[PDB]
Every structure is written in C-alpha cells, then in structure tokens.
Design a protein around this ligand. Structure first.
Ligand SMILES: CC[C@H](C)[C@H]1O[C@]2(CC[C@@H]1C)C[C@@H]1C[C@@H](C/C=C(\C)[C@@H](O[C@H]3C[C@H](OC)[C@@H](O[C@H]4C[C@H](OC)[C@@H](O)[C@H](C)O4)[C@H](C)O3)[C@@H](C)/C=C/C=C3\CO[C@@H]4[C@H](O)C(C)=C[C@@H](C(=O)O1)[C@]34O)O2
Ligand SMILES: CCCCCCCCCCCCO[C@@H]1O[C@H](CO)[C@@H](O[C@H]2O[C@H](CO)[C@@H](O)[C@H](O)[C@H]2O)[C@H](O)[C@H]1O
Ligand SMILES: *[C@@H]1O[C@H](CO)[C@@H](O)[C@H](O)[C@H]1NC(C)=O
Ligand SMILES: CCCCCCCCCCC
Ligand SMILES: CCCCCCCC
Ligand SMILES: [Cl-]
Lengths: 87, 79
C-alpha cells in the first residue's frame, strides 16, 4: 500500500473462472483486488480551484455597472482558465 | 506545472500550503479592489475617504502579513 500512493487497496477476493472453450473445458483461478481512487488530489487540483474560480466571477457583481471592462475581464479570464483546467 | 510531475497522494504536501497561501493573497487583493471600488462610488464622502483608507492600510498590511506568513512557513518546513 505504501508503494501504491494514488489508490487504496480496499478489498481482495479469490475466485474461480473455469470456462468451456472450443478446445475443451479448462480450470481457472482468479484473484481480484479492489482499488479506490484517492480523493485528496482531486479535491486540491480540481474541486477547490474551480470553486475559487467560480467565486472570483462573483466579485464582479460588486463593481459599479458603469465599469463593465472590469466585469468582462473577470468573467472571461475565469471562464478561459476554467477551460484550461479541464483540458 | 509543479503538480503535474507528482503522483496523486492522500496527504497535503508543504508545496500545497505554499501555493494555496499565495493564491489567497492574490485573491484577497481582488477582493480589496471590489470593496474599495464599491464604497468609493457611494455618493456620500463618508464612505469615499474610507475607500482611501482601505488602500493606505492594504499597501502596508498585505506586505507585512505576507512576510509574517513566510516566517511561519519556512520555520515550519525548512527545519
Ligand atoms: C478554501 C477554498 C476557497 C475556494 C478559497 O480558495 C483560496 C482563495 C479563495 C477561497 C477563500 C485559493 C486556494 C487555497 C485556499 C486556501 C487553502 C489553504 C491555504 C489550504 O487548504 C485549507 C483548507 C483545506 O480544506 C479545504 C484544509 O484541509 C483539511 C480539510 C480537508 O477536508 C475539507 C481535508 O481533506 C484535509 C486533509 O484537511 C487545509 C488544511 O487548509 C491549502 C491546503 C490549499 C491549497 C490549495 C491549492 C494548492 O494548489 C492547488 C492548485 O494549485 C490550484 C489551481 C489552486 C489552489 C487553490 O485552490 O488555492 C490549490 O487548490 O484559498
Ligand atoms: C514609501 C512610498 C509611499 O508613498 C507614500 O504613501 C502614502 C500612503 O501609503 C501617501 O500618503 C497617502 O495617505 C495620506 C493620508 O492623509 C494622503 O495625504 C496622501 O494623499 C496619500 O497619498 C504618501 O503621500 C506617499 O508619500
Ligand atoms: C471488497 O469489499 C466489499 C465488502 O465485502 C465487497 O462488496 C467487494 O466485492 C470486495 N471487492 C473485491 C474486489 O474483493
Ligand atoms: C502610511 C502608509 C505607508 C505605506 C507603505 C507601503 C510600503 C509597501 C512596501 C511593500 C514591499
Ligand atoms: C494562509 C493564508 C493567508 C492569507 C492572507 C491574506 C491577506 C490578504
Ligand atoms: Cl487578458
């Protein structure tokens, strides 16, 4: 588990997968591990920064309606950045 | 850039604390702009000179606070 940083090996199972083929019936075992993806990374690199990005687009609701250049600059930069992040 | 060369982990790295903090200092800068600009256009001169006062304080408070941060940060992770 220490050499597996990105996931968490939650469960394992030991089963049989014997099958009937055209050349005959072959005996077969199957072990299965269950990998849960670590969330801390996606919290910090995806969710947090997107909220921080959406929240910025709101601070333009507090600029006077006369200074539209400021509003567009915010709304557009946050939208563009949003794209990049997703890419 | 930095985060792309790293594997996703389950803990918070000291690199995260540092990017996150600087991120805030810039976020609060924007916030200040809105606060200043908003109470600025308000008709009464009561808010107007307050608007001016917020800048004067920011011009010093931000640097001081950021310097304070560095001190805490480096003593915590440079050890
Ligand atoms: C607070 C979010 C809002 C949107 C604020 O965002 C900003 C400013 C604007 C808002 C006020 C910007 C944001 C940082 C935050 C400030 C956050 C910190 C200084 C640190 O985190 C805090 C909160 C965190 O808990 C959310 C908490 O962890 C606890 C609770 C968790 O459980 C909920 C649990 O899992 C965990 C184990 O223990 C932590 C101890 O402390 C710091 C860790 C944050 C770093 C953020 C980033 C680092 O690189 C990321 C990337 O490069 C990017 C593009 C944006 C950055 C960012 O998003 O920057 C980034 O994602 O402020
Ligand atoms: C170091 C360089 C900074 O420069 C200095 O900054 C401060 C504010 O932070 C300015 O002082 C500021 O506040 C005072 C408050 O009464 C105003 O009179 C002045 O109009 C304003 O500019 C100084 O005029 C300027 O000399
Ligand atoms: C792991 O955990 C749960 C609990 O028993 C179970 O439902 C699941 O099938 C298991 N997965 C694997 C791959 O063994
Ligand atoms: C009384 C106002 C003093 C303002 C000084 C601002 C200095 C900022 C330096 C940041 C490196
Ligand atoms: C660790 C967060 C520090 C944020 C300081 C913001 C000052 C404007
Ligand atoms: Cl631009």
């Amino acid at each position: 588990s220490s050499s597996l940083p990105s996931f968490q090996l939650t469960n394992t199972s030991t089963t049989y997968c014997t099958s009937v083929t055209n050349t005959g019936i072959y005996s077969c075992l199957r072990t299965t591990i269950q990998l849960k993806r670590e969330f801390s990374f996606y919290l910090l690199q995806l969710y947090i920064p997107s909220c921080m990005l959406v929240i910025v687009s709101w601070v333009s609701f507090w600029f006077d309606r006369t200074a539209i250049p400021a509003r567009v600059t915010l709304g557009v930069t946050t939208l563009l950045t949003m794209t990049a992040q997703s890419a | 850039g930095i985060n792309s060369q790293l594997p996703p982990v389950s803990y918070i790295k000291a690199i995260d604390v540092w990017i996150g903090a600087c991120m805030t200092f810039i976020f609060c800068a924007l916030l200040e702009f809105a606060l200043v600009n908003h109470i600025a256009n308000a008709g009464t001169t009561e808010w107007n000179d307050i608007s001016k006062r917020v800048d004067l304080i920011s011009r010093a408070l931000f640097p001081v606070l950021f310097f304070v941060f560095n001190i805490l940060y480096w003593s915590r992770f440079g050890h």
